[PDB]
Amino acid sequence: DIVMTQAAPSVPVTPGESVSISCRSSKSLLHSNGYTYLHWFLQRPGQSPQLLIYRVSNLASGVPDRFSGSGSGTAFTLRFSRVEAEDVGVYYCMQHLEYPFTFGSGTKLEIKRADAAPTVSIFPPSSEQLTSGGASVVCFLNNFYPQDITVSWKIDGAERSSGVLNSWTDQDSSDSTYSMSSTLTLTKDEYERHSSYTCEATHKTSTSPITKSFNRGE
Amino acid sequence: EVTLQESGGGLVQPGGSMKLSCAASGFTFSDAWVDWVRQSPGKGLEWVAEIRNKANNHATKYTESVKGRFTISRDDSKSSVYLQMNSLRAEDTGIYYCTSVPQLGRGFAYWGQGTLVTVSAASTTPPSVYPLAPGSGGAGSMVTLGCLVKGYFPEPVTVTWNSGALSSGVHTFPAVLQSDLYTLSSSVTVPSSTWPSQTVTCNVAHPASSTQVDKKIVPK
Numbered sequence: 001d002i003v004m005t006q007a008a009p010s011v012p013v014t015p016g017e018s019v020s021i022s023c024r025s026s027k028s029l030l031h032s033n034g035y036t037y038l039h040w041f042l043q044r045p046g047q048s049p050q051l052l053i054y055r056v057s058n059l060a061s062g063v064p065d066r067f068s069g070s071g072s073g074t075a076f077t078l079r080f081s082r083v084e085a086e087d088v089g090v091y092y093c094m095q096h097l098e099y100p101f102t103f104g105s106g107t108k109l110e111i112k113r114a115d116a117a118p119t120v121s122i123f124p125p126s127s128e129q130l131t132s133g134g135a136s137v138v139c140f141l142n143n144f145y146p147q148d149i150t151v152s153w154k155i156d157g158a159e160r161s162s163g164v165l166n167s168w169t170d171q172d173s174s175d176s177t178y179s180m181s182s183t184l185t186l187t188k189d190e191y192e193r194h195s196s197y198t199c200e201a202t203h204k205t206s207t208s209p210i211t212k213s214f215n216r217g218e
Numbered sequence: 219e220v221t222l223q224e225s226g227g228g229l230v231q232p233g234g235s236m237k238l239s240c241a242a243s244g245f246t247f248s249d250a251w252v253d254w255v256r257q258s259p260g261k262g263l264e265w266v267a268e269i270r271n272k273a274n275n276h277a278t279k280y281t282e283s284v285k286g287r288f289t290i291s292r293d294d295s296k297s298s299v300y301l302q303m304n305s306l307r308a309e310d311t312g313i314y315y316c317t318s319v320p321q322l323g324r325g326f327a328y329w330g331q332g333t334l335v336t337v338s339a340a341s342t343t344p345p346s347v348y349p350l351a352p353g354s355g356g357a358g359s360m361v362t363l364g365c366l367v368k369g370y371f372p373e374p375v376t377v378t379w380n381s382g383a384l385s386s387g388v389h390t391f392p393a394v395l396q397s398d399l400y401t402l403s404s405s406v407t408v409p410s411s412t413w414p415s416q417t418v419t420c421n422v423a424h425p426a427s428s429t430q431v432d433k434k435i436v437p438k
């Protein structure tokens with residue numbers, strides 16, 4: 001099979017600057033007919049892939065003028081003349097010379113912006129959930145940057161690690177931030193054995209963990 | 219106006235069968251060579267199969283791992299292509315996209331929206347929806363509310379807020395799977411001047427079970 005390699009798993013870029021993404025094939029993609037069968041695709045978070053450039057340098061219909069491609073044989077480059085925050089997504093190259101067609105692993109474009117601390121919100125189990133024997137405590141850590149964050153849960157000051165369900169959003173296309181949901185899953189019986197529930201977030205924006213907590217007894 | 223629209227996916231039994239369809243419009247389907255590509259965590263995008271146009275004898279080609287199990291076909295009179303999948307395996311789970319090469323050298327120019335295929339013996343289960351309202355008094359300027367959607371299977375569920383009227387301050391997070399099945403949160407941030415004066419409701423749909431639930435977020 002032909003192997004498509006996109007070394008960079010991601011590339012950080014600030015809006016307004018130019019940037020390039022590289023792809024290499026394991027075989028020349030030049031066909032006997034004289035065309036070079038290398039195409040580029042964008043897949044924004046939660047959407048289908050969409051063609052950006054076909055046959056190395058031809059922009060597809062509707063694609064922004066800011067894109068261009070170059071390359072030959074086994075080496076290709078996708079360039080942005082000026083990046084925009086809405087360009088977040090995964091960029092893939094694909095060889096369309098021989099079967100099976102094969103795609104590179106993709107390079108995620110990450111927009112760099114000013115640091116932003118998380119807006120942290122905690123939620124006691126809903127009364128509706130409690131009557132059903134459930135006690136999930138939810139914590140949203142929203143709209144923060146950079147993307148790494150850590151969450152610790154404490155029940156009456158003791159750290160709890162099992163039964164925690166964590167989920168992250170892709171980078172926001174308008175404000176370049178990230179958000180995370182962390183749910184402490186407890187049964188109603190377990191929920192009532194204690195009173196202090198804290199969601200503590202550690203992120204680069206503060207040397208002190210951000211703490212949100214409540215008391216069951218309230 | 220170009221469009222490709224896949225249908226026919228969803229949950230399927232391991233070792234069972236499922237046929238995906240894709241309806242084309244807005245371009246000359248009969249001249250196009252048409253393909254299926256799927257996406258999975260683990261391989262990223264993966265080419266599945268292709269059927270050529272009549273001029274090229276409707277020839278088919280398949281990736282090694284589905285040869286003999288999947289059959290691609292087309293019906294030019296309905297401008298449609300199909301992928302009949304047999305002997306389904308867990309490795310076949312993924313989103314499947316219909317895409318076409320409308321003319322020579324054009325690449326995969328048009329793609330459908332994608333259809334999730336989940337190969338699992340687990341059964342369909344509806345979600346329960348629980349409002350998430352703030353514990354204290356607001357103030358300050360903005361308040362975050364949420365909806366907990368848990369216990370459903372398979373994915374996906376759609377969540378909107380005020381039927382779509384609120385979308386700019388919403389984050390619907392990826393669902394997490396464990397013993398209780400899927401659990402997903404959606405949050406919405408609005409001015410303290412909007413809620414609780416105005417009704418904020420999360421609307422959840424789970425097409426697999428035909429469940430729809432609207433839950434109003436009320437001060438606790």
Ligand SMILES: CN1[C@H]2CC[C@@H]1[C@@H](C(=O)O)[C@@H](OC(=O)c1ccccc1)C2
Pocket residue numbers: 031037096097098249250251319320321322323324325
């Ligand atoms: C290396 N080639 C070979 C195999 C992949 C790629 C592709 C291409 O050349 O564009 C193929 O042909 C088409 O997909 C096509 C031809 C006519 C009309 C519509 C589509 C022919």
